[PDB]
Amino acid sequence: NLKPVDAMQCFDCHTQIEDMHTVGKHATVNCVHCHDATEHVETASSRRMGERPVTRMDLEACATCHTAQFNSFVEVRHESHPRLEKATPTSRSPMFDKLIAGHGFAFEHAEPRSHAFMLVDHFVVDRAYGGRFQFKNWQKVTDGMGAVRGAWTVLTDADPESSDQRRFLSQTATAANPVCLNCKTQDHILDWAYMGDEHEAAKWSRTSEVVEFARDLNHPLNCFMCHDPHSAGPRVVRDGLINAVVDRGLGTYPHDPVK
Amino acid sequence: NLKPVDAMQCFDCHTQIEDMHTVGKHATVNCVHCHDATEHVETASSRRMGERPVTRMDLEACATCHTAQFNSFVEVRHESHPRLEKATPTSRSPMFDKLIAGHGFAFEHAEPRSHAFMLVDHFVVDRAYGGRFQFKNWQKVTDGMGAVRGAWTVLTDADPESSDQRRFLSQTATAANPVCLNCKTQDHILDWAYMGDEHEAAKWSRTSEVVEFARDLNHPLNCFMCHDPHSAGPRVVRDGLINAVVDRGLGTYPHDPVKSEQQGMTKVTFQRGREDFRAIGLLDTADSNVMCAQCHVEYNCNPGYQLSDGSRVGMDDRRANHFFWANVFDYKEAAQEIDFFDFRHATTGAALPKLQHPEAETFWGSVHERNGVACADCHMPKVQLENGKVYTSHSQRTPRDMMGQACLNCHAEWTEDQALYAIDYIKNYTHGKIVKSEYWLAKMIDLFPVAKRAGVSEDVLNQARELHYDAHLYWEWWTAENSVGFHNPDQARESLMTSISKSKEAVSLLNDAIDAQVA
Amino acid sequence: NLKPVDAMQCFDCHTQIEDMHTVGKHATVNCVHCHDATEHVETASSRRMGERPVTRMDLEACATCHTAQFNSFVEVRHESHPRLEKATPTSRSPMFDKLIAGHGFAFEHAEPRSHAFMLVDHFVVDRAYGGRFQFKNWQKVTDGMGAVRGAWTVLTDADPESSDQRRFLSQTATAANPVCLNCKTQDHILDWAYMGDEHEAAKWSRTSEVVEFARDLNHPLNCFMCHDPHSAGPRVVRDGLINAVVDRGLGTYPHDPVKSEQQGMTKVTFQRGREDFRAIGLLDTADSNVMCAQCHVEYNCNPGYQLSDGSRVGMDDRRANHFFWANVFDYKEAAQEIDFFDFRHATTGAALPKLQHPEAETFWGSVHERNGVACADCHMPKVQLENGKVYTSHSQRTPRDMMGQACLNCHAEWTEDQALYAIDYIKNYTHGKIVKSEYWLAKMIDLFPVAKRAGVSEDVLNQARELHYDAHLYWEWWTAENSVGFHNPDQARESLMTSISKSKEAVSLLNDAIDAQVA
Ligand code: HEC
Ligand code: HEC
Ligand code: HEC
Ligand code: HEC
Ligand code: HEC
Ligand code: HEC
Ligand code: HEC
Ligand code: HEC
Ligand code: HEC
Ligand code: HEC
Ligand code: HEC
Ligand code: HEC
Ligand code: HEC
Ligand code: HEC
Ligand SMILES: O=S([O-])[O-]
Ligand SMILES: O=S([O-])[O-]
Ligand SMILES: O=S([O-])[O-]
Ligand SMILES: O=S([O-])[O-]
Ligand SMILES: [Ca+2]
Ligand SMILES: [Ca+2]
Ligand SMILES: [Ca+2]
Ligand SMILES: [Ca+2]
Ligand SMILES: [Ca+2]
Ligand code: NA
Ligand code: NA
Ligand code: NA
Ligand code: NA
Ligand code: NA
Ligand code: NA
Ligand code: NA
């Protein structure tokens, strides 16, 4: 069973977290729900991390107290046709191939389906990784809950021994890069510097080998993308959005300064 | 927003809570979710309460983190007919009035409906409070969530100025007493000593003014009735059940010492002033059979009379709060064991028992119980989801509404229609024997005034009255029990055949005696 | 094809019609739609009819221009069980035969079905005409449109050669008389003097041979019963209702003088030979409460007896056509006011009233009536159309079939299931008290022969008979009334509790008296 940690000890070093946590609607929610900090706390100073604490990024971290939101999130809408190519006469763009010729989307561009699949679908689409990643079998395409538990529980890698982008199937492309992942998962939220700029503290950046990066990522659309886990208040985490809205001064509603 | 309190401070005085809280699945759940103890902490001493902390007993205290269980619990099953009188030709007991004459249930006995309404229905039923309490208007009868938020949000009191039980409408009774409430709410869990015995720490007891007690109570079927709020482990809190299982050493399965040992109960006592005050029964397993047995049992919760001498047994007597914890065929011996009966029949003068919804005692020994099946398997099954986190449905209702999750989950050889047909075979057959038992009971009852008026001897009338006790018991168990035989079809059949046998014997006895007086 | 007549010619003699016709919403509707007056116009004088014009009374006279109202009116609700006897354990009054013994309704009293059938059902029911009239075959029972086209298109007469009321089948009665027909048809509207009093201009009256009268009548619930054909304004035509509201000055809402004034009735009289002959009541507003009260009321439409001396009150007496226009708690006083009762109970010998479908008098004072709600809001709501011209549904039926247009149109906080559940709460509760009132009534009734045979005194039997009157009234109102309490749940509850109180008092009285005779 989970044993709570003394959050007051954390707060002696983590003052920005204290200011958020103590005031919001997660003031009673202990750190141990999402952080394994035993070795960290034994070795840190306020100026030196010491051992890196482990942070849970899976959606079931929130599902224990917020089952209703989690269960509605992971539902698969079966009526949202899966793997349906847009460049067909009965879909969105009957002449897409002629019009887009020269772009990687010609290799495959399907209609979106339920959010549970976003990361797996990113990994398997013909335009992304040269066909490197596939569902373990054709049955796994139905498993939204499985995808949510982790992409690598439902996918295989054609060559675990290499990390370069290349074609494993003839009519595929290798368009994926580390920026794509920011709109599929935020598992890397502590390992990616703002905008994906190079940074001493970042494991991953815009110039990483996307295949290696992919292997570190598991969960789609993390609940903390819209909800700060410390304050429980509404937020965004996506760097490009903050950059447009704040850094470039465009505002949340560029056409409406009052709003 | 809630601010967490320092639980270490509490634990310095509350070692039983520390031992439970730090070790279970609520170890990270702060006391402030359920307790406002600011003034308490400022004034308590090592073993005196000082200022009383405020304890939340509303179910939304748990709904905070367990929305799915809460929302399934509060669902109203509109198909469960509301306020439907059982003494009607289309309900459970067509001849109930004749057979129960003398008892307060003659004033009204409706079929059960959804659990959300249990406390308000207790308050408003015609037999309970003289019609004192009513819904604020006739629209409120639909409002399950409202009733859950609190009885007094949806009800009115005809006279806030008085506290005595009395009749405000002519055809009502005042049967309610404080024991009733234990099977409707546990809002009083900190204000009621074990068994309702007098106790200097208890605001309320068996002898309290029930109208005053009623006004203090709000919520139905509190989530903590089955789940310890500190350890989150399975438990019961009902005094009468702990008394039968533990104090009387009968076991959770009285017919099965092994199962009783494997699926047992540990009584945990809390003290006030270092004197025993209240108790809970922690369960070895999350055994719904025992959890639901907190209420779905035959019981005393009322005054009565002694079988030996007919003297009154009042609310002050321990027997006014009693779980017999006996099947239909051990019941007469259990009632003799405490020297108790409920009422004298208004027509026959027989001393008779009053039977209450004995689902737990009926389910014992059934093929299902013997195979390790429990109430929740049929009435609170796990939800099946194409994609999602599984949880237990808390909408306690007929398995007819969820046959795939209930019956068919174990009976793979049946379609839904076949499983429903199996249920109906048993219920139809049992109901036919209920109706025939009533026919014979009524035929016997109607001969009593004829016998008395023909001058048949008291000795013969008393023999017939002895037969009436048994004819009544072996019938009433089954109009009281809610499954119409399904929970134990062989037992229902044998009991109801015994009722008919007893009535037939009495009919012959009386007819012969009458005919002799005439000739 | 129809050719219009010169209405100016008619108006020269018919000034009352000119005043109504030229001003209302039928100012452009030519007389030829409803009147063939060629020979009349050739022979009439200023104040003698001469040849009688032919007046169309069939509903298709209106369907010509009002197809939607006509087609909704004639719809048969197949879910309204046809020819379903109320004295059965699964209908309204399980103990009806015991309780009504002595009255002609013992021969047959079915639940109401769709309005299309009212006249044919009146003609064929076992209690009415000795079984004289029958459907032509058993297939005709489905034919609502056929019945609307005319009763005699779908029925036969066992003996066209005789005109006396008599029994053609053994277990029938001959309760029908000419007053009945006023609540089944108004085909006789020009042939029946106000109240059915003798009148030299009337073909038919209270004292007519009903079999001969029956043969002259064809159509159910004529459209003009609620709508004046000349002005198209709202009205009533029923004599008994105009008598209560206007002649007796009771008002359309007898408990509310203001509402009575705002929603009142103006009596308009038509003469023959310059003597008053017939009357209508023009309504200030299109108030369905008063329109439906032409028939859905408690009434006398039959011979009876005087309470004072037991003497016969025959069809010749004004009291044989009477609207009490009184709620259940004012009824006994209203019956004493005219010194009248219906029958003597066959077992108890009590003088008793017979109660008829008192929906109007029950609805008074309910939360709905007090809030300005009227029968049509629930039973004839406006049609809701995605695209179209709105009209009023004339399919008078339970709101269960049109919950969106009825209940939910005002109760936006409820789903359909919740609103149905609210209805069922009241109906279930009320039906339980009906059944219990019957139980107590039957227990009392069965003691009468025992008391008489034990030699209990006439004085005690007469006290019990007085109690029987009240026990009967406070029960029978509710098996007569069609909503099972829904129209006024608090009143149903108080009345039925009073019935039980009265029966209980009588049971105790008789049991004690019997026991004293034995000892
Ligand atoms: C139980 C130990 C929790 C864990 C794990 C998570 N949350 Fe939570 N959350 C919890 C509580 C007791 C509350 C307060 C409820 C109230 O209304 O009083 C919350 C609240 C939220 C909210 C709403 C906050 C607001 O300002 O409106 C959100 C959006 C929320 N919680 C999100 C959330 C996330 C994303 C979690 C996983 C990272 C998570 N919670 C875990 C209890 C618990
Ligand atoms: C029994 C005779 C089967 C019938 C009828 C259907 N399926 Fe099947 N399928 C069956 C087996 C034994 C397997 C292999 C299972 C394993 O994991 O070893 C499968 C596999 C599939 C797959 C995956 C195929 C792949 O190349 O990965 C799919 C998508 C699938 N099955 C679907 C499916 C459908 C839709 C069926 C009705 C049209 C169907 N199966 C019938 C056995 C049997
Ligand atoms: C945020 C600004 C995004 C970036 C960066 C990437 N994607 Fe995306 N993706 C995004 C949305 C809002 C959607 C759903 C709406 C839609 O029109 O599809 C998607 C969907 C996909 C899918 C599934 C559908 C499809 O196009 O076949 C795939 C396979 C996918 N995205 C792949 C992908 C790649 C390879 C990216 C980097 C080159 C990439 N996405 C970035 C939002 C965003
Ligand atoms: C010693 C100085 C105490 C401190 C610190 C806390 N509590 Fe207490 N509490 C104390 C006593 C002596 C009693 C009477 C029971 C007993 O153990 O002798 C209590 C009682 C309670 C209760 C029950 C109240 C009721 O209505 O019956 C609760 C719910 C409770 N206490 C809670 C509580 C909390 C949450 C504390 C930390 C904030 C806390 N107590 C500290 C003594 C002492
Ligand atoms: C959030 C601050 C919670 C409050 C308020 C309540 N509960 Fe809880 N509960 C919470 C957590 C984080 C967990 C652990 C989940 C897991 O499986 O790890 C639980 C667990 C339970 C359980 C399951 C217990 C078991 O032994 O498996 C139960 C039955 C339970 N909780 C009940 C419960 C009750 C009755 C509450 C109101 C008194 C209540 N919880 C509040 C979080 C929170
Ligand atoms: C637990 C041992 C109980 C005691 C003590 C009381 N009741 Fe009860 N009650 C209990 C159950 C399990 C049920 C549902 C099953 C059933 O057969 O009804 C009920 C139901 C009611 C109801 C609703 C149905 C009805 O009978 O009208 C009412 C109104 C009610 N109970 C009232 C009531 C009174 C007045 C009590 C003290 C005399 C009482 N209950 C005690 C379980 C238990
Ligand atoms: C006894 C009549 C119960 C009441 C009152 C409540 N719950 Fe319950 N709960 C009950 C059972 C039989 C079970 C299944 C036990 C098993 O292991 O099979 C549960 C389970 C839970 C859980 C655990 C997670 C799950 O399986 O859903 C939780 C968190 C829970 N219950 C919460 C809960 C709430 C919030 C309640 C009040 C609305 C509540 N329970 C009451 C039995 C009973
Ligand atoms: C006392 C606190 C109870 C507990 C514990 C359990 N039940 Fe119950 N139940 C109780 C009452 C007072 C009522 C009637 C409520 C009313 O307002 O009339 C009931 C009712 C039921 C029903 C009928 C529901 C319906 O749709 O008609 C069922 C199926 C039922 N109870 C089952 C049940 C189960 C399986 C329980 C253990 C999980 C359980 N109940 C506990 C009182 C109490
Ligand atoms: C066509 C030649 C008609 C015949 C035959 C009948 N009615 Fe009529 N009706 C007709 C017209 C043109 C109108 C006016 C429509 C408008 O709203 O302007 C009406 C109106 C009515 C009304 C509404 C009256 C009101 O005060 O709002 C009613 C109730 C009505 N008509 C009834 C009615 C009856 C009962 C008929 C058979 C006796 C009948 N109409 C025949 C046209 C025609
Ligand atoms: C052909 C093989 C038929 C079957 C199948 C059904 N019916 Fe019939 N029915 C049939 C005939 C030739 C007749 C006589 C028609 C006539 O007017 O001469 C009937 C009659 C009836 C009746 C009237 C009975 C009577 O008046 O005594 C009814 C009520 C009736 N039919 C109903 C009916 C039902 C409900 C059927 C299915 C159960 C049915 N019929 C079948 C021919 C045939
Ligand atoms: C208006 C004051 C009426 C008088 C006069 C008569 N009836 Fe009636 N009847 C009336 C209504 C509003 C209803 C439907 C509501 C109900 O409770 O039935 C009826 C119904 C009938 C029926 C059908 C149902 C049944 O009772 O079998 C029949 C056969 C019937 N009425 C016959 C009848 C007789 C014989 C009358 C004179 C003795 C008589 N009705 C008068 C309203 C009124
Ligand atoms: C009393 C029992 C009625 C009978 C008989 C008929 N109608 Fe009616 N009508 C009635 C009411 C309560 C209303 C609604 C009044 C309001 O203003 O709310 C109506 C309305 C009409 C209208 C007006 C247009 C409309 O709203 O639909 C017409 C044209 C009409 N009724 C025609 C009509 C016909 C053709 C009838 C015989 C089939 C008929 N009405 C009978 C009440 C009553
Ligand atoms: C006398 C001419 C009546 C008028 C005016 C109204 N009603 Fe009536 N109603 C009457 C009878 C004789 C019957 C029974 C007909 C039969 O053949 O059995 C009825 C019946 C009803 C019903 C029941 C319909 C069903 O589906 O079972 C309803 C709902 C009803 N009546 C309502 C009603 C309303 C609202 C009226 C004013 C608009 C109204 N009726 C007038 C006799 C007469
Ligand atoms: C508007 C024309 C309404 C129609 C149609 C229905 N109802 Fe109604 N109802 C209406 C009002 C204005 C009120 C009073 C609201 C208040 O709180 O002041 C009501 C009341 C009720 C009640 C309560 C009755 C009581 O307490 O005595 C009930 C049970 C009710 N309404 C139910 C109901 C049903 C089932 C309806 C369709 C058959 C229905 N109402 C229609 C307004 C209107
Ligand atoms: O805390 S007191 O008991 O010394
Ligand atoms: O009265 S309760 O026990 O059903
Ligand atoms: O028309 S006559 O009366 O002169
Ligand atoms: O007989 S009629 O009044 O129902
Ligand atoms: Ca889609
Ligand atoms: Ca039920
Ligand atoms: Ca009992
Ligand atoms: Ca009907
Ligand atoms: Ca009458
Ligand atoms: Na789609
Ligand atoms: Na398409
Ligand atoms: Na039911
Ligand atoms: Na039934
Ligand atoms: Na009898
Ligand atoms: Na019906
Ligand atoms: Na019925």
From Swiss-Prot, chains B, C:
| pH effects | Optimum pH is 7-10 for nitrite reduction, and the optimum pH is 7 for sulfite reduction with only 20% residual activity at pH 7.8.
Q: Which residues bind heme 6?
A: 180, 183-184
Q: How does activity depend on temperature?
A: Optimum temperature is 80 degrees Celsius.
The residues that hold heme 8 are: 375, 378-379, 487
- The covalently linked position for 3'-(S-cysteinyl)-tyrosine (Tyr-Cys), per the record, is 299-301
Q: Name one GO biological process term.
A: anaerobic electron transport chain
Q: What is its EC number?
A: 1.7.2.2
Pathway in which this enzyme or protein is active: Nitrogen metabolism; nitrate reduction (assimilation)
Compartments where found: Periplasm
Query: What is the reaction catalyzed?
Result: 6 Fe(III)-[cytochrome c] + NH4(+) + 2 H2O = 6 Fe(II)-[cytochrome c] + nitrite + 8 H(+)
Give any Pfam family that matches: Cytochrom_C552
Post-translational changes noted in the entry: The thioether cross-link between Tyr-299 and Cys-301 may play a structural role in the active site cavity. Besides, it may lower the pKa of the Tyr hydroxyl group. An additional covalent bond between Tyr-299 and Gln-356 has been observed in some protein crystals, but this may be an artifact that is due to the formation of tyrosyl radicals when the protein is exposed to oxygen.
A single GO molecular-function term is: nitrite reductase (cytochrome, ammonia-forming) activity
Source species, domain of life: Bacteria
Under which main EC class is this enzyme filed? oxidoreductase
Residue numbers binding heme 3 = 26, 62, 65-66
Per UniProt, activity regulation is: Inhibited by azide and cyanide. Subject to competitive inhibition by sulfite.
Positions annotated to bind heme 2: 31, 34-35, 230
**Residues engaged in binding heme 1:** 10, 13-14, 40
Residues the entry annotates as binding heme 5? 115, 292, 295-296
What exactly does this protein do?
Catalyzes the reduction of nitrite to ammonia, consuming six electrons in the process. Has very low activity toward hydroxylamine. Has even lower activity toward sulfite. Sulfite reductase activity is maximal at neutral pH.
User: Tell me, how does this one assemble?
Assistant: Homohexamer. Dimer of trimers.
Protein name, as recorded: Cytochrome c-552
Naturally occurring in which organism (per UniProt): Thioalkalivibrio nitratireducens (strain DSM 14787 / UNIQEM 213 / ALEN2)
Query: Gene name, please?
Result: nir
